Amino acid sequence: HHHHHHMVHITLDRNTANSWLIISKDRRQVRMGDTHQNVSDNKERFSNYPMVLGAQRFSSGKMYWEVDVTQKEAWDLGVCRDSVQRKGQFSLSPENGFWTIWLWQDSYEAGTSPQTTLHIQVPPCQIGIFVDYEAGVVSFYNITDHGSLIYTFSECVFAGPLRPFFNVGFNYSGGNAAPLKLCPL
Ligand SMILES: CC(=O)Nc1ccc(CN2CCOCC2)cc1
Numbered sequence: 001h002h003h004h005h006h007m008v009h010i011t012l013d014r015n016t017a018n019s020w021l022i023i024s025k026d027r028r029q030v031r032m033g034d035t036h037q038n039v040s041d042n043k044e045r046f047s048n049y050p051m052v053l054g055a056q057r058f059s060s061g062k063m064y065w066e067v068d069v070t071q072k073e074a075w076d077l078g079v080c081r082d083s084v085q086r087k088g089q090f091s092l093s094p095e096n097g098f099w100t101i102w103l104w105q106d107s108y109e110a111g112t113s114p115q116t117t118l119h120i121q122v123p124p125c126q127i128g129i130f131v132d133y134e135a136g137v138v139s140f141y142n143i144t145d146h147g148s149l150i151y152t153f154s155e156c157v158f159a160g161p162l163r164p165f166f167n168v169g170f171n172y173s174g175g176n177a178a179p180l181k182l183c184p185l
Contacts, residue, residue, distance in 0.1 A: 003139075018047070060133050065128075073169070077166060079098075079099050080097050080100075082163055
């Protein structure tokens with residue numbers, strides 16, 4: 001892929017974060033805290049899962065960013081509609097406004113309904129996410145493996161502005177405390 005030149009500087013939106021998340025001063029790193037992080041509730045916060053959005057909203061053009069997932073056991077990454085459900089239980093699917101991949105229990109899967117098995121030979125330490133708004137495309141790249149394609153959602157029906165989407169995952173195991181980090185351009 002030669003998508004690097006559509007690179008955008010993503011920052012995390014504290015107001016959307018689940019109340020257990022800890023976001024760094026530069027708004028580029030997020031991890032699961034061991035308790036409630038002493039913030040007020042609001043209608044934006046994801047209540048049920050350790051999720052947060054980027055502050056940027058995209059309604060046109062081509063956008064590319066990279067995320068570090070080093071030593072995590074579980075995470076979700078991709079984009080979502082600005083209008084996605086925040087409260088209660090929901091599944092990650094394009095019908096619910098999400099275009100995502102994840103690691104869970106030693107397998108990688110794309111967030112279709114039902115979910116799709118991914119075939120990755122080199123476990124990624126950094127993921128590239130490419131959005132072409134006009135083409136209706138979301139693609140995922142394995143930066144550890146020289147940029148090899150992971151998955152492409154095509155014929156996407158975005159149906160509104162898009163936000164970068166993150167889930168640090170739970171840490172029931174004690175092996176998933178590590179942060180997600182937005183990588184420098
Ligand atoms: C039964 C079943 O398939 N469970 C399941 C639930 C959630 C996800 C999505 N992500 C995975 C990474 O951790 C955060 C959540 C994937 C699988």
